[PDB]
Subunit: 252 residues, 3 copies
């Protein structure tokens, strides 16, 4: 139950330099492998930089706030090149960048194919993150994956709002349980059925021997609207009631 | 009124293998065309794989939940290569992947340039989606587009919250319609004017010959704040009232 | 306090044509520079088109609504090629595209390395934006950056909702300040502590010599739930009260 970010095409990648396009970030996913034909080159089984120094990197980013729980790195699949240590940097706001664990130099790879995995406890909370190779065998060449928490069912909800009143004397007389319905139409139709939350912002009602009785509920909710059922009981005379409603659509 | 996803640069793409960088996913949009100069190669008018088998794919992804309504595929513009059938797979959570229509093998292209379009009824609801070529003429080479519903006006709203009370005896005496205003300042200024929803969470008020009368409304809403107007009428003495407010900014 | 979009890997890029993959959009960030080795080509210090006409472009996009505040362009770092003027187009819905400032032809570069910056007042509000070169020295070749407002702390909140009542006669007798607590468990645990907004949707209560007194508040809020404290005072007998709650989690 972690998300493989690169495997799912969830992040944009950007390297400092590329040896050429046949060594670009597009070739960098963990376990990347291509044709084992030696007579025709189809690209490195890695990102490989052009410049060899301590200033190269790949940035991975997108708009969403991610909770990164691990990173895995690997050397290059088709030649003896691998990153032996690296630093990490990240940003939540895309303005201020932070050094992971005070600029910790993480021990990394020692061969082409063995995976080295570092776990983040607590998760790194970030929009963008950058791997910064510090040392290497032969060339700055790597494959990698970033692991994040899945998105919660409750995130990114859609919302519409409005108000509803009795607007007449429908509940202003009589005895026992008495109800009226006001049908509400959402300004725009939802793609799935929302929930509808309500809160009273006007009471104009008479007590019944000192007892106040009123209720509202949302019912019969559809993509297009819902019913506000206004309720009184005993012998209360309710002159008017008003609710604000907040309709919330999830997972869409 | 559908959105052309690749045309709008809305999705990250990732292929299994590329013949080389000059045949990568960057060349895969429907109707992609480049220089018709035969003396200098500027890349294939297609994505083309490196390995030829039944295991190649392109994944298209981003963080947002998309409602995919169609897919179009095409062969390669500058050579006789095209995909003749394919399967589709998708994921909503980026953990669990689903086979489209029980692993349906979709009949696809028979030439370089004719478009073949499949419509999804109901839409495929997904964060990432993958085209998996099964058979081909000459090479696994294609162009394509994914079509999605546009984003609703009501999605991804911004929210700020707080509470407001009378806090004094301003409405606790007198006759007829009586009102007071409490100006509220949002903790942070909005980029556009929000709506402001309210709900009562405290009443401390005297009836007027048994009649209860109170109201709140939000008014004079700006990017910076709003006015909670507290209202009573008849001869009611209102000691205190409290509302929670929810301010919602759309389309920003 | 603006965000450098390409530097942070925040946008997908898509060109009309590329001279080849070694001249693609991946080489287009402002101040892009690679190996100054003349004996081995590692790609142009620019995006460069393949076709030379007035119809080439790069589209930059993602799902989020961005407020673009500036654009900077530069020519090519390693050869005498630069764009001398261009037009801009953008879209908020990814269906309807708009010409910036009525199709204004913007004066651009006159050398390899000097930066030319245009500021947008008001910001361009858009999901995708496209630079459309009109004239050029030698070739359509450029580097660039797009600048946007940072995301507000209040955007993309997570939400859960529910209702809570006294459900018994706990507050229906006695004298002075009397309170009861109902512990509420969120259907799903949050990653950080939310706020909890409330609004009354049922009153069943007796006045005390004509005075109505009731209150609710949310307290002891955690990732897992909160306490609704129901309150009365004086000599009021409260039979039942019901609140809808809206719990909002920010910045996650
Ligand atoms: C069924 C019915 O009317 N029930 C009410 C109850 O809700 C409450 O208001 C009470 C106050 O003494 O009076 C009655 O028992
Ligand atoms: C204008 C005015 O005071 N209107 C009120 C009305 O709102 C309601 O409370 C009624 C109850 O009998 O008493 C009056 O008519
Ligand atoms: C402490 C206490 O009971 N205060 C109350 C106050 O809240 C209000 O209801 C008032 C009405 O005359 O009666 C008392 O003073
Ligand atoms: Ca190979
Ligand atoms: Ca060509
Ligand atoms: Ca160079
Ligand atoms: Cl009364
Ligand atoms: Cl009341």
């Amino acid at each position: 139950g972690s998300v493989s970010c690169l495997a799912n095409a969830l992040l944009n990648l950007r390297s400092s330099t590329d040896y050429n396009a046949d060594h670009g970030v597009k070739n960098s996913i963990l376990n990347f492998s291509n044709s084992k034909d030696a007579s025709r080159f189809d690209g490195s089984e890695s990102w490989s930089s052009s410049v060899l120094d301590k200033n190269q990197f790949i940035v991975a980013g997108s708009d969403s706030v991610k909770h990164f729980v691990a990173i895995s790195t690997q050397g290059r699949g088709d030649h003896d090149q691998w990153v032996t240590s690296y630093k990490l940097r990240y940003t939540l706001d895309n303005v201020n960048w932070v050094e992971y664990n005070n600029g910790e130099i993480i021990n990394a790879n020692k061969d082409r194919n063995s995976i080295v995995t570092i776990n983040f406890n607590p998760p790194i909370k970030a929009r963008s993150i950058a791997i910064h190779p510090q040392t290497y065998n032969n060339h700055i060449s790597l494959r990698w994956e970033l692991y994040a928490l899945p998105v919660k069912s409750y995130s990114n909800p859609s919302v519409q709002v409005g108000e509803v009143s009795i607007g007449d004397r429908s509940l202003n007389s009589g005895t026992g349980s008495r109800t009226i319905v006001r049908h509400v139409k959402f300004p725009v139709e939802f793609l799935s059925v929302p929930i509808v939350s309500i809160g009273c912002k006007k009471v104009d009602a008479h007590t019944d021997n000192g007892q106040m009785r009123w209720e509202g509920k949302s019912e019969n909710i559809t993509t297009k609207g819902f019913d506000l059922t206004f309720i009184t009981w005993g012998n209360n005379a309710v002159y008017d009631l008003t609710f604000d409603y907040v309709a919330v659509e999830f997972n869409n």
